[PDB]
Amino acid sequence: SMTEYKLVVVGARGVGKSALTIQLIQNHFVDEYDPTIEDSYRKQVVIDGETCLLDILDTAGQEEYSAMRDQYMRTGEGFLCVFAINNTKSFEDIHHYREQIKRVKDSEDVPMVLVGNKCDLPSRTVDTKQAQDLARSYGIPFIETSAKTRQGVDDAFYTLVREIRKHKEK
Amino acid sequence: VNPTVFFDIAVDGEPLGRVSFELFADKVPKTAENFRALSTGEKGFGYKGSCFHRIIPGFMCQGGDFTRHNGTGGKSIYGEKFEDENFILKHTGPGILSMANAGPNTNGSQFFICTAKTEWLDGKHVVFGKVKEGMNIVEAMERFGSRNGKTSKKITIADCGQL
Ligand SMILES: CCn1c(-c2cc(N3CCN(C4CC4)CC3)cnc2[C@H](C)OC)c2c3cc(ccc31)-c1csc(n1)C[C@H](NC(=O)[C@H]1[C@@H]3COC[C@@H]31)C(=O)N1CCC[C@H](N1)C(=O)OCC(C)(C)C2
Ligand SMILES: Nc1nc2c(ncn2[C@@H]2O[C@H](COP(=O)(O)OP(=O)(O)NP(=O)(O)O)[C@@H](O)[C@H]2O)c(=O)[nH]1
Ligand SMILES: [Mg+2]
């Protein structure tokens, strides 16, 4: 037997939630944009020498359905909060996702990781310091990633598991 | 007179039946003409052989990606994409034919057929036609779908054209 962790990937449309998840599960990337309705994946990994099962919910960033997130937020144990480093609006959208998660779970202590994706791209509009400062104000880790180069992909998911472990063993 | 076009639907290559559509050229001529031309293949490309890649029971059947065959592609007769012509017509119920998009002014070739009223799409997707005959074929397509739209059998436009 191994422990299962219910991870949920959230963030504005087009920030790379699916590309990150597909890199984790399938080890590939494509430039094509296939917008998500809702997808679920499973993968076993070893994190700090301990095998575990990731149950990953890849959610829609399509903002018109923002009123349909409560149930997956109640069910999820930890949240990868993704923005794109070249999209300031998606960084602004982060605050609303976090406030939604805290409000739905009625807790200030919800396992989360801030993920700045697309770090391979030269057109950066969100400074690393800007995101580190926000994550510090949230009390959560920040990881820069590229689903294209795989930079930080494993680290982002593994860190979220570590955050959930701390919350459960609190 | 508004043009009418047909799709001959197949399920894992086995014929299912024919759906016909009225295209509202009287209200959305540019959008109806794109769908009409793609249904005849007269530009050298179009819907023939493409699949319905997303079928969600209770909501809609979506298809039209003839360039990539994975739900990411498609193109119009005017270029890769064209503007939203108007939002005069609404998603009033089953049978409505409307354009898929990736935000404002991104109409290509992907389209969806409603199997229910989808009024929250009003003003965001251009309605341009409706099923004339064969709605029972569209209903028969729904059981090959799922909650997130992934299909359990390959649902294709085996043939299509103008009536
Ligand atoms: C939150 C879950 N969820 C739902 C949904 C919503 C609801 N409601 C909402 C309405 N409530 C009433 C007011 C009270 C009741 C509850 C219930 N259950 C569900 C589903 C089944 O829960 C899993 C949806 C939905 C739609 C999206 C993302 C998530 C969605 C989504 C992503 S991208 C897009 N939408 C537009 C898309 N773009 C592309 O495909 C781009 C591809 C690339 O560039 C060309 C091409 C496109 O044009 N269409 C053509 C139009 C129908 C549309 N797809 C689609 O699939 O809608 C699916 C669905 C089910 C109709 C809506
Ligand atoms: N250069 C680069 N492109 C990326 C990266 N991650 C995603 N993309 C691209 O960004 C687009 C959207 O990616 P996708 O993973 O579909 O984003 P999403 O957040 O899942 N979108 P949605 O909320 O609609 O499901 C695609 O064209 C994809 O190739 C990245 O790290 N670098
Ligand atoms: Mg996605």
Author numbering:
A (entry chain A): 0 to 169
B (entry chain D): 2 to 164
Q: Any passages from the paper?
A:
RAS family genes encode small GTPase proteins that regulate cell proliferation in response to growth factor stimuli. Here we describe RMC-7977, a reversible, tri-complex RAS inhibitor with broad-spectrum activity for the active state of both mutant and wild-type KRAS, NRAS and HRAS variants (a RAS(ON) multi-selective inhibitor). The binary CYPA–compound complex then binds to active RAS (with dissociation constant Kd2) to form a tri-complex structure in which CYPA sterically occludes RAS–effector interactions. Although neither RMC-7977 nor CYPA alone exhibited any measurable binding to GMPPNP–KRAS, RMC-7977 makes multiple π–π and hydrophobic contacts with RAS in the switch I (SWI) and SWII region once the tri-complex is formed.
Kd2 values for the most common oncogenic RAS variants were all within threefold of those for wild-type proteins. The ability of tri-complex formation to sterically disrupt effector binding for the various mutants was also measured, revealing a good correlation between the Kd2 measurements and the biochemical EC50 values for RAS–RAF disruption. Preclinically, RMC-7977 demonstrated potent activity against RAS-addicted tumours carrying various RAS genotypes, particularly against cancer models with KRAS codon 12 mutations (KRASG12X). KRASG12X mutant cell lines were highly sensitive to RMC-7977, with a median EC50 of 2.40 nM. The proximity of the RMC-7977 binding site to RAS mutational hotspots (residues G12, G13 and Q61) presents a unique opportunity to expand this approach further by designing additional mutant-selective tri-complex inhibitors.
